Enzyme design. Structure first.
Site, mmCIF file in Angstrom:
data_model
loop_
_atom_site.group_PDB
_atom_site.id
_atom_site.type_symbol
_atom_site.label_atom_id
_atom_site.label_comp_id
_atom_site.label_asym_id
_atom_site.label_seq_id
_atom_site.Cartn_x
_atom_site.Cartn_y
_atom_site.Cartn_z
ATOM 1 N N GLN A 277 1.110 -1.494 0.086
ATOM 2 C CA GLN A 277 -0.026 -0.131 0.010
ATOM 3 C C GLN A 277 0.773 1.414 0.035
ATOM 4 O O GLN A 277 0.481 2.559 -0.195
ATOM 5 C CB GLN A 277 -1.068 -0.033 1.345
ATOM 6 N N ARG A 290 2.360 6.650 7.528
ATOM 7 C CA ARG A 290 1.261 6.544 7.024
ATOM 8 C C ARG A 290 1.451 6.502 5.498
ATOM 9 O O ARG A 290 2.676 6.728 4.736
ATOM 10 C CB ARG A 290 0.459 7.900 7.263
ATOM 11 N N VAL A 291 0.791 5.938 4.858
ATOM 12 C CA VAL A 291 0.733 5.847 3.130
ATOM 13 C C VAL A 291 0.524 7.466 2.578
ATOM 14 O O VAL A 291 -0.149 8.027 3.145
ATOM 15 C CB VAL A 291 -0.347 5.124 2.563
ATOM 16 N N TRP A 293 -0.802 10.162 0.364
ATOM 17 C CA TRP A 293 -2.038 9.903 -0.513
ATOM 18 C C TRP A 293 -2.011 10.700 -1.757
ATOM 19 O O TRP A 293 -2.778 11.828 -2.340
ATOM 20 C CB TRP A 293 -3.289 10.446 0.084
ATOM 21 N N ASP A 394 -9.728 1.937 -1.222
ATOM 22 C CA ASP A 394 -10.083 2.060 0.232
ATOM 23 C C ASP A 394 -11.131 3.427 0.408
ATOM 24 O O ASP A 394 -11.135 3.995 -0.695
ATOM 25 C CB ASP A 394 -8.965 2.563 1.119
ATOM 26 N N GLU A 397 -16.859 5.886 2.701
ATOM 27 C CA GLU A 397 -17.730 6.165 4.015
ATOM 28 C C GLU A 397 -17.498 7.224 4.680
ATOM 29 O O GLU A 397 -18.489 7.680 5.534
ATOM 30 C CB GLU A 397 -17.673 4.927 4.990
ATOM 31 N N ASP A 461 -11.683 -2.994 9.034
ATOM 32 C CA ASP A 461 -10.656 -2.961 10.130
ATOM 33 C C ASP A 461 -11.401 -3.914 11.395
ATOM 34 O O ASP A 461 -12.171 -3.359 11.906
ATOM 35 C CB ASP A 461 -10.651 -1.636 10.664
ATOM 36 N N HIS A 526 -2.087 -8.650 6.222
ATOM 37 C CA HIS A 526 -2.009 -6.984 6.360
ATOM 38 C C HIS A 526 -1.060 -6.893 7.532
ATOM 39 O O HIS A 526 -1.009 -7.531 8.526
ATOM 40 C CB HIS A 526 -3.373 -6.363 6.724
HETATM 41 CA CA LIG Z 1 -13.126 -2.241 13.472
#
Ligand SMILES: [Ca+2]
Ligand SMILES: [Ca+2]
Ligand SMILES: [Cl-]
Length: 667
Positions: A277, A290-291, A293, A394, A397, A461, A526
Site C-alpha cells: 500500500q 502512513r501511506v 495520498w 479504500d 464511507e 478494520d 496485512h
Molecule cells: Ca473495527
C-alpha cells in the site's frame, strides 16, 4: 399476485401480508425533522431534532391504471400518496410521496409475524439475524471495539467517538430478506433506520419526503438471491490467479518486498502476489508511518518497481497497490484537481479539505462528470498501465455532510451513495481497459450497486483481538449479511488490522486467522497500522511453515472455489453461504452467526477464541466427514479437536468433490 382488500385495508403480495392499516392502527406517519450531525472524522454521531410526527389515520383508495392509489391524510391539511403497482418484472412497487418537501420524515410499518427472521441490510458485524433490534443505516467508520461494555470501545470513545456500536458499518444497505421468503429493497440514499424489534411489524424510518420500495418473493432463498442480484447486480468471475496462493501485505519498498517474497516462496508457501500500500510513498506522522495520498508510483520508496513488476509477473506474482477517493493537498493530483474545479466545496465556496491529523486531503467530487473521468484516468494511467494486478480501493464511507457537490444534491443524500459511485469508478477503469476478470480490486465501503461494481469486498478494520464484535468472529456475520444482500465475494485481513490501546496481534491470532482465510475465496495479509507491534507472516519458522500448509490447503481447493465463484457470477449464489440456503427445513440454522458453508459441500466453523484446543459447532442433518481425520458425523451439535492448522471443517461424503476433499489431510 396483488390482493388488496378495503377506513381499514390489507395488501397481500403472493400471499404474504405486506400492509395493514386502520384508523386505529395506521401504517403511515409523516412529519419533519432537522438532522443533528457531529461527524467526528467519520465516526458519525447522527440523530434527529424531531419537529413533527403525525399519524395519517385516514385513507381513500382509488383503482389506478397500474394498480392502486391510496390517499393518506390527517385533518384537512396533511397528506401523502402511496401508489401500489407491479413493476416491469412483476415486483411489487410501493411509491410514497408526502404532500410537500417540508415533510421530510416518513415512518412506514410493514406487517410481520413474531417468528420471522430478517437478514441483510448490507454488511453487519454483530448480528446476522437482525430480528429484535433497530438498525440505523448510515455509512461510517465501522468502530473500534463496537460494544459499549468492552474496554477497547470505551477507550476509543474517549477519543473522537471512535468505539462505535453494534450497527456501525461502512456498507449499510436499505435491503433485507425475510423468512416469509421475500426481499425488500428501498431506492433512497437518505438516512434510514430499519427497526426489526416489534413482533407484529417492521418499521422503516426515512429522512426524506418520498420513498420507493420494491419487493419480490420466491420459493427458495437461492431463487430469492438470484432475483435480488438480477435487481442489484452480479459480480464478475475472479481472475484465475486469485486461487494460486496468498497475497503478502508488505510495506517498506522494493527490496523488502523481494526478501519477504523469497523467504516465503523458498519455504514452500504458495504466493500469488504482493500488496504494497506504500507504493505511493510514506508520510511520517506523530503516530508513525502512513501511506502518502498521491496516486502515482513513488520511485524513491519503490525503486525499479516498473521493471520488478515484470519480473514478478514472470514468476507468477502479481503486484497490488492502493487508492482512495481523497488527494493529499500538498501533492500533484490535488493541485490539478483544484485547478480544474474537480474537488467538492465547502459552504463558503472554497475547495473542501478533510483533516487527517496533521495533513489534509481534497475530496474528489465524483458527481462532477469531468472529475470522475479524470480520476478514472488516474487509475488507468498510474495503476493499470504500471502493470498492477489489483489494489485496495479504500474509503468511501466519509463523504462529509457539509460538502457541496457538483450535481447540487445535498451531501446528506449523497453520503450513503458515495461508496458505489467510487466502486463504479474502479469498475469502469477495468471495463475501459479490458481488464474485467484479470485485475482484482477490493473495497470495504459499499452501497446499493456495489453488487455490480465491486469485484471483491473485504471486511475492513478488525481489531487484532478475539472479541465477538470486532475480532476474528465478526467477519462471519459480515460475510453472511453481505451474501443475503447480494454480494458473494468476501475476505478479511489475515490477522486483523487495528492495533491501538495496547492491542497487539499474537502469533496464535495470526495462525488461527490464516486457518479461517484458507476457507474463503481470497487469502491476503496485512501488517496492521503498527506493524512493529504485531506478529507477521514471517515471524518465525513455525509461522512460515503454517502459511505453507494452509496456502497448500487453499490452492488444493482451486477448482472447487472456481466453480463456486462461477455460480456467484451467473446467479448470485454466494461463495460463503448461510446454512439455511441448503438446509431450509432446519430451524436451528436460522440463528447461527459464526459458521458457514463454503460452496455447497464444505461446512466451516472458525475457531474465534484464544487458547482453544477444541471447538463446538452445529451440523445440520447430512453425512459429514471431518476434513483432517475422516471421522464421520451426522446432524447435531458436535465438539471436535481443533489444534491450529486443523480448523473445524467438514465436508459432505456425497459430494462429487469428495476425492479432492479427502486429499486435504495428507497435505
Ligand atoms: Ca473495527
Ligand atoms: Ca533513490
Ligand atoms: Cl453460530
Amino acid at each position: 399476485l396483488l390482493d388488496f382488500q378495503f377506513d381499514s385495508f390489507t395488501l397481500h403480495f403472493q400471499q404474504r401480508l405486506i400492509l395493514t392499516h386502520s384508523k386505529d392502527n395506521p401504517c403511515l406517519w409523516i412529519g419533519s425533522g432537522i438532522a443533528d450531525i457531529d461527524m467526528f472524522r467519520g465516526n458519525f454521531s447522527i440523530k434527529d431534532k424531531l419537529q413533527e410526527k403525525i399519524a395519517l389515520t385516514d385513507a381513500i383508495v382509488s383503482q389506478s391504471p397500474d394498480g392502486w392509489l391510496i390517499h393518506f391524510s390527517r385533518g384537512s391539511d396533511i397528506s401523502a400518496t402511496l401508489n401500489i403497482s407491479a413493476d416491469d418484472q412483476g415486483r411489487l412497487l410501493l411509491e410514497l410521496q408526502n404532500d410537500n418537501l417540508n415533510h421530510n420524515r416518513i415512518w412506514l410499518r410493514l406487517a410481520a409475524q413474531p417468528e420471522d427472521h430478517i437478514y441483510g441490510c448490507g454488511e453487519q458485524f454483530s448480528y446476522f439475524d437482525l430480528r429484535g433490534k433497530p438498525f440505523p443505516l448510515w455509512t461510517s467508520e465501522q468502530g473500534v471495539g463496537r460494544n459499549k461494555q468492552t474496554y477497547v470501545t470505551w477507550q476509543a470513545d474517549c477519543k473522537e467517538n471512535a468505539g462505535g456500536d453494534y450497527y456501525w458499518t461502512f456498507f449499510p444497505q436499505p435491503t433485507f430478506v425475510s423468512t416469509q421468503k421475500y426481499y425488500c429493497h428501498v431506492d433512497n440514499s437518505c438516512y434510514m433506520n430499519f427497526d426489526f424489534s416489534a413482533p407484529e411489524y417492521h418499521e422503516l424510518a426515512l429522512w426524506e419526503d418520498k420513498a420507493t420500495l420494491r419487493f419480490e418473493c420466491a420459493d427458495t432463498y437461492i431463487s430469492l438471491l438470484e432475483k435480488l442480484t438480477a435487481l442489484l447486480g452480479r459480480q464478475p468471475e475472479l481472475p484465475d490467479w486469485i486461487y494460486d496462493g496468498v497475497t503478502l501485505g508488505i510495506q517498506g519498498g522494493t527490496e523488502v518486498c523481494q526478501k519477504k517474497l523469497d523467504t516465503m516462496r523458498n519455504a514452500g508457501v504458495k504466493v500469488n502476489g504482493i500488496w504494497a500500500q506504500d507504493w505511493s510513498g510514506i508520510r511520517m506522522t506523530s503516530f508513525g508511518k502512513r501511506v502518502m495520498w498521491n496516486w502515482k508510483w513513488n520511485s524513491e520508496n519503490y525503486p525499479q518497481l516498473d521493471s520488478r513488476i515484470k519480473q514478478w509477473n514472470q514468476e507468477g506474482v502479481q503486484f497490488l497497490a492502493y487508492i482512495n477517493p481523497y488527494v493529499a493537498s500538498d501533492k500533484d493530483l490535488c493541485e490539478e484537481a483544484a485547478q480544474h474545479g474537480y474537488l467538492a466545496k465547502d459552504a463558503s465556496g472554497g475547495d473542501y479539505l478533510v483533516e487527517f491529523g496533521e495533513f489534509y486531503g481534497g475530496v474528489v467530487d465524483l458527481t462532477n462528470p469531468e472529475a470522475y473521468a479524470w480520476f478514472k484516468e488516474v487509475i488507468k494511467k498510474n495503476m493499470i498501465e504500471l502493470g498492477c494486478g489489483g489494489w485496495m480501493a479504500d474509503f468511501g464511507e466519509y463523504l462529509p455532510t457539509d460538502t457541496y457537490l457538483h450535481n447540487g444534491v445535498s451531501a446528506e443524500i449523497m453520503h450513503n451513495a458515495w461508496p458505489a459511485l467510487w466502486a463504479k469508478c474502479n469498475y469502469e477503469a477495468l471495463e475501459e481497459t479490458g481488464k474485467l476478470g484479470e485485475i482484482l480490486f477490493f473495497m470495504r465501503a459499499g452501497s446499493t450497486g456495489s453488487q455490480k461494481y465491486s469485484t471483491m469486498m473485504w471486511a475492513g478494520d478488525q481489531n487484532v483481538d478475539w472479541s465477538l464484535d470486532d475480532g476474528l468472529a465478526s467477519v462471519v456475520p459480515a460475510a453472511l449479511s453481505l451474501a443475503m444482500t447480494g454480494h458473494g465475494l468476501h475476505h478479511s485481513d489475515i490477522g486483523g488490522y487495528t492495533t491501538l490501546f495496547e492491542m497487539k496481534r499474537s502469533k496464535e491470532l495470526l495462525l488461527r486467522w490464516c486457518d479461517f482465510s484458507a476457507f474463503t475465496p481470497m487469502m491476503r495479509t496485512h501488517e496492521g497500522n503498527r506493524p512493529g507491534d504485531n506478529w507477521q507472516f514471517d515471524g518465525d519458522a513455525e509461522t512460515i511453515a503454517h502459511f505453507a500448509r494452509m496456502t497448500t490447503v487453499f490452492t488444493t481447493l482451486k477448482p472447487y472455489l472456481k466453480e463456486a465463484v462461477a455460480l456467484n457470477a451467473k446467479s448470485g449464489l454466494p461463495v460463503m453461504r448461510p446454512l439455511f440456503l441448503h438446509y431450509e427445513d432446519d430451524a436451528h440454522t436460522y440463528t447461527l452467526k459464526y459458521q458457514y458453508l463454503l460452496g455447497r459441500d464444505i461446512l466451516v466453523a472458525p475457531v474465534h477464541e484464544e487458547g482453544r484446543s477444541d471447538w463446538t459447532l452445529y451440523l445440520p442433518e447430512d453425512n459429514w466427514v471431518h476434513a483432517w481425520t475422516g471421522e464421520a458425523f451426522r446432524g447435531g451439535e458436535v465438539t471436535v479437536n481443533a489444534p491450529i492448522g486443523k480448523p473445524p471443517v467438514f465436508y459432505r461424503a456425497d459430494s462429487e468433490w469428495a476425492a479432492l476433499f479427502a486429499s486435504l489431510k495428507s497435505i
